[PDB]
Every structure is written in C-alpha cells, then in structure tokens.
Design a protein around this ligand. Structure first.
Ligand code: FE
Length: 308
C-alpha cells in the first residue's frame, strides 16, 4: 500500500494527533526538568499548538522577562558571527527582519508577524508545533510551503544550549532562509518527494534534510558559507564548520542520503551545495528514484496536491 499524506493545506491539521506526547522537557536530563514553572510554561505552548487550526492567526504570547533575557543573550552572541559566516541570502534579509519583524535583543518576535512576512516573500508560512512530529509529517508540510515551528524557548539556565529546537533556533536559524525564493523552492522539493514515499525513503529524505536545511554549507563567490539552520543558531558549530577541522564533501544525494550523523557533537563532515537551485534539481532527480505509484504536483492557486 501507500501511506496517507495530506492533499490540501488544511489537512495538515491532522498532524496534531500524531506527535510524541512526552516532551524532552520531561527528561531528567533536560535543563528545565526540575523547574515547575518551565514545565507549566511548556504545557501552555503545547496547548496553543494543539488547538491551532490552519487559517487562524497564530496566537500572540507575552514572554516573561526571564524568557526575553535568554533570547537576548542568544541573539547578541550569535549576531556577531553572521556578517562573516552566514550565506549572502541570510545577511540580505536579516535587516528586514529586524525592521518589520522586531528581531532585536529586547523582543522575542511573534510567530504570526514572522509568518506574515514569510508569506509576502515566498508564500511560506509557519504553524506552531506542539511536540515532535514524525519525519513523514514534518517533511510533508514543506510540500505546502508550511514550516512547523516551536514557539517556546529553551530553559534560561543554559542560554547557549538546547537539546531540542526552540524559538531561537527557528527564528535565527530557519526563518531567514525561508525568505529566499530559491531555498523555498528547494525545501518544497524535499517536501514533495516525501508525499506517499515508503518509510525507508522518508528516512533517506530526512537525512538529506539534515545535511542541507539543518547543517548545510554552500559555495558563495570563491568562498564557503553556512545556510544550515542548526549551524546558524549554534555559536560553537557556526565557527567550527568554517574552520580547517571539518571534512567537506560535495553535495551528492546518492551518498548524502545514506550518510550517518551525530546529534550531540559537532558534525565531523558537511556537504557543500553549489546553490539552492542546484540542490533543488538534485532533489528533483532523486525523488525520481523513489518507488511511488504516482507523481505529485502542488497547485499554489488552490493549495492542493495533484496526484498524477
Ligand atoms: Fe530545525
């Protein structure tokens, strides 16, 4: 058989019933495990995500001073590195995010505002996400240019550390790239490749995603820059990834897809993309090899997937 995949953008609403119900914040190892206020706060964000329905504005939340402080620390510390380490596309849009979205040390941007901004740039939109989505579900949303993103913030005890994605990672790592048409197209291609793909292929796609959207490096001029969300929101690794230490291989989906990675240490190797358009073409071809009984196409006019 073939696994269920949404056919219209509203159908993404079914994902809320298939997330991991036991958050990382319930783990004794989590920095905010013994913090009842944090736990309660996380539950509050989970409830907002859980009741969210497509088409509604994403609820605005008043962040606590403590939360603003953490955001402020992370923002200030990472910003110094962007002009020199981030890809051109990241740097070109950041000033605009600062202007229209309130990306500033004293203010955590509201997802609704950021969503509206992405929509006018590439038609990308955000949806608050409760817990951990399956790889299939997370990737599927990309087909509709929908990014599921966290609204909560990491525990304030370790501002430069997070065992999971949090709002700092989403806003400083993902968002800027989604403002670029080429990257948006590339991302969506990964999304389309997964609709109805068998589980073992979803895993290959998840691995390509990891080495591109999360930890990708790209050629720029005669230089190399970071575009991976995991690198752009990590002070340590962003500096490391462009040093002499890591091994850099050229993006080759045949191999990238089978590659193993760590999730607790810096990556021993990165794949470098020629451009986002090139990467998109590579995904397109690769998707051609996924044993799927049909072909999919997205109709931006009606926001529906067309099964051919
Ligand atoms: Fe991420």
């Amino acid at each position: 058989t073939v696994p269920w995949f949404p056919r219209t953008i509203q159908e993404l609403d079914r994902f809320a019933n298939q997330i991991l119900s036991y958050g990382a914040e319930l783990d004794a190892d989590h920095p905010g495990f013994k913090d009842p206020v944090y736990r309660a706060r996380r539950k509050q964000f989970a409830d907002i995500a859980y009741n969210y329905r497509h088409g509604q504005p994403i609820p605005r939340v008043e962040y606590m001073e403590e939360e603003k402080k953490t955001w402020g620390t992370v923002f200030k510390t990472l910003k110094s590195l962007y002009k020199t380490h981030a890809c051109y596309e990241y740097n070109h849009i950041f000033p605009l995010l600062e202007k229209y979205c309130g990306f500033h040390e004293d203010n955590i941007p509201q997802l609704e505002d950021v969503s509206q901004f992405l929509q006018t740039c590439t038609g990308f939109r955000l949806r608050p996400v409760a817990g951990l989505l399956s790889s299939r579900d997370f990737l599927g949303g990309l087909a509709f240019r929908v990014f599921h993103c966290t609204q909560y913030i990491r525990h304030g005890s370790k501002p430069m550390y997070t065992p999971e994605p949090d709002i700092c990672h989403e806003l400083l790592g993902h968002v800027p790239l989604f403002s670029d048409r080429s990257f948006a197209q590339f991302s969506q291609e990964i999304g389309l490749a997964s609709l109805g793909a068998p589980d073992e292929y979803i895993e290959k796609l998840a691995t390509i995603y990891w080495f591109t959207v999360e930890f990708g490096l790209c050629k720029q001029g005669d230089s190399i820059k970071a575009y991976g969300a995991g690198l752009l929101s990590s002070f340590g690794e962003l500096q490391y990834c462009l040093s002499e230490k890591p091994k850099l291989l050229p993006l080759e989906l045949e191999k990238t897809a089978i590659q193993n990675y760590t999730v607790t240490e810096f990556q021993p190797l990165y794949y470098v993309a020629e451009s986002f358009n090139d990467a998109k073409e590579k995904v397109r071809n690769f998707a051609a090899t996924i044993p799927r009984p049909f072909s999919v196409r997205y109709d931006p006019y009606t926001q529906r997937i067309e099964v051919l």
